[PDB]
Structure 1
Amino acid sequence: SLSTEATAKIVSEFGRDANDTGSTEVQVALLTAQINHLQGHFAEHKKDHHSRRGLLRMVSQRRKLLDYLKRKDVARYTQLIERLGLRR
């Protein structure tokens, strides 16, 4: 899983305050790095019974945590998905 220091850097990456942690920009980037850490676990492990309980729960759980940052702020949404490399 995503370690404490790695989360702390991503907070310090997009820190409006260096203490803010209500920045969805951070939070999008957290599950981004979290499941990119897990893409080596799920390209490895395919249909593992509860793959959606601990595999897709983060399919949708990353997905809808994007979905307000989807409809969040056009001046910043344009900037963020540029930096995060998001396809859409």
Structure 2
Amino acid sequence: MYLDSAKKAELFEKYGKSVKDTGSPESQIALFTFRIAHLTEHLRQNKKDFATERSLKMLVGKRRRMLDYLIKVDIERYRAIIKELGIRR
């Protein structure tokens, strides 16, 4: 996960109103998906990093719970975010 403050700020500006909104469900889902992809890339090389695995799984669980909250609150926002991120698979 090549993650830094500049990338986090760019993600928060892209998803969610204003760049200071680090806590929005959309911002959190975007951040989780970004580091999930990067951790997958790391694992394909370090196939024996069982600690980076299950950290990946805990990130996946967090993203799923945020998506379930979006289901319970506003379905249209969930459709928009999964369309913009290409999550469902």
Task: Tell me the percent identity.
Answer: 41
Q: How far is 1:34 from its partner?
A: 0.9
Contact in 2 for aligned 1:12/1:18 (Cα 8 Å): yes
**Which stretch of structure 1 is more off in the superposition, 59-68 or 30-39?**
59-68
Structure 1 position 85, deviation (Å): 0.9
TM-score when normalising by structure 2: 0.76
Unaligned runs of 5+ in 2: none
1:57 CA displacement: 2.8
Instruction: For structure 1, list consecutive stretches of 5 or more residues without a partner in the other structure.
Output: none
Classify 1:43/1:62 alpha carbon distance in 2 versus 1 (closer, same or farther; 3 Å). farther
User: After the TM superposition, which segments of 4 or more aligned residues of structure 1 sit over 4 Å from their partners?
Assistant: none
Q: What root-mean-square deviation, in Å, do the aligned CA atoms of Structure 1 and Structure 2 show?
A: 2.1
Q: Once the 2 structures are TM-superposed, how far is the Cα of residue 35 of structure 1 from its aligned partner?
A: 1.6
